[PDB]
Amino acid sequence: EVETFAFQAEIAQLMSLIINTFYSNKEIFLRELISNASDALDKIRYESLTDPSKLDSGKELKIDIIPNPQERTLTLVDTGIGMTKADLINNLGTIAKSGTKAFMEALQAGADISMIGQFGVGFYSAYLVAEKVVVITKHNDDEQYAWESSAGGSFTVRADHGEPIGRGTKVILHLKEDQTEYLEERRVKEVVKKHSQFIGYPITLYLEKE
Ligand SMILES: C/C=C/Cn1c(Cc2cc(OC)c(OC)c(OC)c2)nc2c(N)ncnc21
């Protein structure tokens, strides 16, 4: 059963700005999504020190980046803490409102879009290159969910009965037609080396088969 929700007006405004503003330095999306994965990995690692059972859902802490030219998708998979249903519908957005406001104000005062991560809303930089984002996520003590948005003011959340991911998050970027450069491991490697070379988890960059 698919439930459809409206973004808060401010977040919809932010998404529209990211989609409609002329800004050529789009590659920064990858640094932001990798940093989100790293943060999530940091969180489950820290929690596991006082409750080792939190790793019963998977011991390995890693990030995989998988380009699929045929599906026109770039997928970032982490085995971090994951997100709950409450995160997806309510709590991440509640937190994001103030960061969104501060970022929008910063842009008006001369900041550029590449500073988005400092405001906690770097996730939304995905829409620099993606027409649709699907997030499959699994947190301990909650079910696996699929979140989806093609912007336009709404997102959906549904229980996901696809392949279990155990714990963590799969961010599936359905790329815009003119952003297919990010479907080549060569380009992805260049971006990772430039912006994400010191991330403290193994990042495996898959090669496209075709
Ligand atoms: C500061 C927000 C952290 C939530 N988060 C995001 C970014 C993110 C995902 C989101 O939903 C999937 C968000 O709400 C739509 C959101 O709003 C700022 C941010 N990636 C991940 C991830 N890989 N693993 C665990 N949590 C994550």
Element housing 37 (H / E): helix 28-50
Q: 123: CA distance to ligand 1 center in Å?
A: 6
Nearest CA to ligand 1 atom 9: 123
Q: 1: CA distance to ligand 1 center in Å?
A: 22
Cβ atoms 77, 64 nearer than 8 A: yes
Cβ atoms 119, 99 nearer than 8 A: yes
Domain, as residue range, for 86? 1-210
3 state DSSP class of 23: coil
Q: Amino acid identity of 205?
A: L
Tell me the C-alpha distance between 77 and 121, whole Å: 19
Kindly give the number of the ligand 1 atom that is closest to the alpha carbon of 81: 25
- What is the per-residue burial (b if ≥16 Cβ within 10 Å, else e) of 81-107? bbbbbebbbeebbeebeebbeebbeeb
Tell me the C-alpha distance between 69 and 72, whole Å: 5
Cβ atoms 106, 119 nearer than 8 A: yes
Kindly give the number of the ligand 1 atom that is closest to the alpha carbon of 135: 12
CATH assignment at residue 120? 3.30.565.10
**How many separate domains does the chain show?**
1
36 marked as part of a ligand binding site:
yes
Residue 33: left (phi > 0), alpha (psi -120 to 50), or beta? Answer: alpha
Q: Residue 80 carries which DSSP code? A: S
Kindly give the number of the ligand 1 atom that is closest to the alpha carbon of 96: 18
Tell me the C-alpha distance between 132 and 126, whole Å: 9
Q: What are phi and psi of 47, to 5 degrees?
A: -60, -30
Q: What are phi and psi of 142, to 5 degrees?
A: -145, 170
189 marked as part of a ligand binding site:
no
Number of H helices, E strands in the chain: 5, 8
- DSSP sequence for 48-72: HHH-GGGGTT-----EEEEEETTTT
- DSSP sequence for 131-178: EEEEEEEE-TTS--EEEEE-STTEEEEEE--SS--SSEEEEEEEE-GG
Residues near ligand 1 with C-beta < 6 Å? Answer: 36-37, 40, 78, 80-83, 88, 92-93, 96, 120-121, 123, 135, 147, 169
Q: 83: CA distance to ligand 1 center in Å?
A: 7
Q: Provide the angle, in degrees to the nearest 10, between the axes of the packed helices 92-108 and 9-20.
A: 50
Q: 111: CA distance to ligand 1 center in Å?
A: 23
Longest distance between any two alpha carbons in the chain, whole Å: 47
